[PDB]
Amino acid sequence: GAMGSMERASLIQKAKLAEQAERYEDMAAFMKGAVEKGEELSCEERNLLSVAYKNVVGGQRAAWRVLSSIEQKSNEEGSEEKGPEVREYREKVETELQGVCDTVLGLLDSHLIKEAGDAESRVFYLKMKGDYYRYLAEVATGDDKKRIIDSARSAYQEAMDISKKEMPPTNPIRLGLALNFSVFHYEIANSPEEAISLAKTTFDEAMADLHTLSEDSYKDSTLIMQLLRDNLTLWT
């Protein structure tokens, strides 16, 4: 633990500074350090953790796709042999991406998920677990691809089950989970019908619960509902 000598509160403060500076790798390292203090995370702290790693892995995913596309072109019929470099460098980026995913899954497994008893924490972390398995799945091509996919599904499904029992249909965490699980279905599980059904049902059940909310909660819920709608527009 490179952050082992820094106070928890200082790590959180520095994570917030890092976010303002758009230094997401630093933000992620500070939040990793905070998690490794062993105390449970507050709502705000969970959001900092997620934002940091989401930004880091996002850069790597975008880079991977660029490189993958080039590599695929280099293997078309009529493309000139450019040598091993494209593959080597796509592998380098892929391996770093996988390391980031393993790091996050490691924090969730040691010991964020097992100590999370409230619905809002447990659903948040299990959604994250599904998400980072999904990012692994996006780059997986080996004999482990099926098990990675099944790990994503399993985490998403446990999260869905708790969210349906314990949260209202407008809960932004619940909505965000459904959004992400629907995308999992669509393009990881090759289940577009399931994707569409989940997104529709989720949208419709939130719509019918909006009347219960404050103006501020209404804004939070309708933001994610619009994402469901955006995908449904592309899918139907």
């Binding site: 989401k54 892995v57 996002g58 850069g59 975008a62 796709r65 959604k127 998400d131 959004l179 994402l227």
Partner: peptide, 12 residues
Amino acid sequence: KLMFKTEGPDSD
């Protein structure tokens, strides 16, 4: 790749 909407920072 056409990327669909997922929660949070669209950082990719």
